[PDB]
């Protein structure tokens, strides 16, 4: 298994995971440490705590990233280079910033770092989704997770050691910038699968538009060359609704023939442009306009910039069959791990009665090493074994690890038993993490992997966010061993939903494409409307939260609004999930 690591792609994946992980701890945790040694609350500023929301709400930033292709490098690589450049500049600026004058804009710069870091995460996740082959998806996710954890470790756990010694905060931040530099260089060395039939067709149309000025001929030749390259590139690509019909199907034969005719017309136009001809070129250009008004609309003869730039990822994802089943699976697959890690610290402090320092050291060392090793082992099992079966095994192992936590709670206190049990739990957590990131990368349509991956990451995090309270209420009501038994039984539904959607998962693994539901008659649109209403209610509640935070006016009904919005949203989700299961059942027979 050393061969994959010997390949440079593993190295670039590791370094980019490091690049993504570095700003997370520096943005908040290291900043909490700096404010704590300064004794500053870092609250009431109201610019801070946007840094936490920046990662959560990255799916709002994503559509510009999946829509826009930077002129330098490619879409993924160019956005990555840009985002790392802004991060490096911002960290260097904060290091340059002198607290001697005032706090000035430390919180604003932290929010800028958080926005640029959520941006870089989006772009790295998209680049990792597209660049990684299907069987390599698991191992690449494992390496990315390893680099991510290592970045969090250096920015969060080496930060105190470095700051307490001679290096100081200014040099610490500039050294983080320097460690970001080879991430930028390696991003330049990173591969780029720009692909994108939509992007190639948009280049085709942009150059055709700059060619409608065909009286100057100082631009028609170059623009026609760009059109020909884009058309040749888009001919070998696959259009939407035809991705599953890859091996020379009649539909893709018509696609290829249409692009054959198109590139022939670019041949004629370039023949006339190379002559330097004005009049003949213009006559055959009017004929070209007629033929494009007659022939070439067959496959996506449309512009690219649209509201769709932001709607198309969601439209596609929801258009896929078993979309809501996958939505719920993403939400509650890591539910057991969220339950365990939410209260592991307090359980070790009180439930098993360990000393705080012992718990801190054993967690910091064993949990981190176990998550890393589980990530690697999960990835190697992923390249060995299919996605669905590996997710099944790793979810079952997550449940049995929570069962090990129940063993710990019932069993008398021992450092060694706690060590082995927490190592097993974090081992299964790392394996499930690698398999889950692989699943996220599998689900993205790659055409817009940034937006769909950001949606799925927010989906995974929404479970974790709501986990904390329910775990606290459960432990206070029923105790710790009963809580961990329920933790196992709540990790079960993720496995159950995986078993439900195993047909879709195996289909996607083998064909690399998704079915789009043809079963929609009236109910699917109803569930989509329910979700849209839930999202609008969430946005309105966020506006109310801002109004309450500014404290000009406050209305107590916002809590009920939250509960009602959650009820409607989950109602839509379950309705869609039941429809999705019914559609899968219909496809089965």
């Amino acid at each position: 298994y050393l061969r994959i690591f010997q390949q440079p792609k593993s190295a670039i994946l590791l370094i980019l995971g490091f690049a993504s992980g570095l700003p997370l701890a520096l943005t908040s945790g290291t900043l909490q440490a700096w404010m704590t040694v300064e004794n500053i609350d870092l609250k009431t500023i109201w610019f801070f705590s946007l840094v936490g929301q920046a990662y959560v709400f990255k799916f709002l930033w994503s559509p510009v990233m999946d829509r826009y292709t930077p002129p330098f490098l490619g879409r993924r690589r160019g956005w990555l280079v840009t985002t790392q450049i802004l991060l490096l500049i911002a960290i260097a600026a904060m290091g340059f910033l002198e607290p001697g004058t005032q706090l000035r804009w430390m919180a604003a710069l932290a929010v800028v770092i958080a926005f640029c870091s959520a941006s870089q995460d989006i772009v790295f996740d998209a680049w990792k989704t597209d660049v990684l082959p299907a069987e390599e998806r698991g191992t690449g996710a494992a390496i990315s997770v390893l680099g991510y954890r290592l970045g969090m470790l250096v920015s969060g756990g080496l930060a105190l050691w470095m700051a307490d010694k001679w290096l100081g905060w200014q040099g610490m931040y500039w050294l983080m910038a320097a460690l970001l530099v080879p991430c930028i260089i390696a991003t330049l060395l990173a591969p780029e699968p720009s692909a994108d039939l939509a992007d190639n067709w948009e280049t085709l149309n942009d150059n055709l538009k700059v060619i409608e000025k065909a009286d100057n001929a100082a631009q028609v030749k170059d623009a026609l060359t760009k059109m020909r390259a884009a058309a040749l590139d888009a001919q070998k690509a696959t259009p939407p609704k035809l991705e599953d019909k890859s091996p020379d199907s009649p539909e893709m034969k018509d696609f290829r023939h249409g692009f054959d005719i198109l590139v022939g017309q670019i041949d004629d136009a370039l023949k006339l442009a190379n002559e330097g001809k004005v009049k003949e070129a213009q006559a055959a250009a009017e004929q070209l306009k007629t033929t494009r008004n007659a022939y070439i609309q067959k496959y996506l003869g449309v512009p690219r910039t649209l509201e769709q730039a932001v709607v198309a990822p969601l439209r596609d994802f929801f258009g896929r069959n078993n979309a809501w089943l996958i939505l719920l699976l993403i939400v509650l697959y890591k539910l057991g791990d969220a339950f365990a890690m939410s209260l592991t610290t307090t359980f070790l402090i009180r439930g098993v009665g360990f000393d705080a320092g012992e718990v801190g050291m054993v967690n910091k060392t064993l949990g981190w090493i176990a998550t890393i090793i589980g990530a690697l082992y999960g990835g190697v099992l992923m390249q060995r074994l299919s996605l669905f079966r590996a997710l099944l095994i790793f979810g079952i192992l997550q449940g049995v690890s929570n069962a090990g936590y129940w063993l710990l709670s019932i069993t008398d206190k021992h450092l060694m038993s706690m060590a082995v049990a927490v190592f097993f739990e974090n081992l299964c957590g790392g394996m499930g993490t690698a398999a889950f990131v692989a699943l996220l990368m599998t689900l993205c349509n790659k055409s817009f992997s940034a937006t769909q991956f950001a949606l799925l990451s927010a989906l995974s995090a929404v479970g974790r966010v709501y986990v904390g309270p329910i775990a606290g209420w459960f432990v206070e009501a029923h105790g710790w061993p009963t809580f961990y038994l329920f933790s196992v039984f709540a990790a079960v539904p993720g496995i159950l939903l995986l078993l439900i959607c195993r047909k879709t998962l195996e289909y996607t693994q083998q064909t690399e494409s998704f079915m789009m539901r043809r079963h929609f008659s009236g109910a699917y649109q109803f569930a989509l409307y329910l979700l849209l209403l839930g999202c609008l209610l969430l946005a309105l509640w966020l506006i109310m939260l801002a109004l309450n935070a500014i404290d000009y006016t406050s209305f107590s009904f916002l809590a009920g609004l939250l509960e009602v919005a959650a009820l409607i949203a989950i109602a839509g989700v379950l309705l869609g999930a039941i429809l999705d299961y019914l559609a899968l059942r219909r496809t089965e027979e």
Partner: antibody
Amino acid sequence: EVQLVESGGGLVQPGGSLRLSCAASGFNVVDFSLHWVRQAPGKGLEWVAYISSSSGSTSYADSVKGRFTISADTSKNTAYLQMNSLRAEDTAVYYCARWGYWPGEPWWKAFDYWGQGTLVTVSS
Amino acid sequence: DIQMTQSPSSLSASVGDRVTITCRASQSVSSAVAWYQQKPGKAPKLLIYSASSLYSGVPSRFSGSRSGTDFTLTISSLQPEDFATYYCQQYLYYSLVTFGQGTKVEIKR
């Protein structure tokens, strides 16, 4: 079973201007566009010109435009490159390669068959 | 005819050693890049067309790959007869068909 033999030697005045004949055997001259590629002694290849006998299309390099004229005789299945106003760096080996029709794999097989080349040179 | 500056200008690899020669197109040329092997005193031979593609029964020692505008020709198992001059030729635009630089090295032995 095809080849592009290039010739043209004969009784001609030295220090003038000569045309390079590229006889195509095993395939019609109209089915493949013939491109003259110039390899100067000591440096790499450089596409000099091309003719598309199917439609009469013709193109040249920037360094040879206005002085060269590439034609093609479909009757005898051969191409020509009448090089005029030859200059010191015009000396090179001229391989008449072929290049298929678009659309299809013939186009993607760019220069799938070349010719042994003729060493055009200026001397005494 | 200007690319990025590289410390190695030529290629020299042992027999049986996998070696790669790469050139980056100025602009996107799609998969329309061909690789030719020209032994001295002989016309170039089309090794790889479409920058990765080859038919059945063709030599399999030579391989090609493309990522964006970057094209790489790799020889899996280098052979004594492999030593020649390799040209990367984008073949998209007729009037500006561009080629490689050159590689003049004896048979590494």
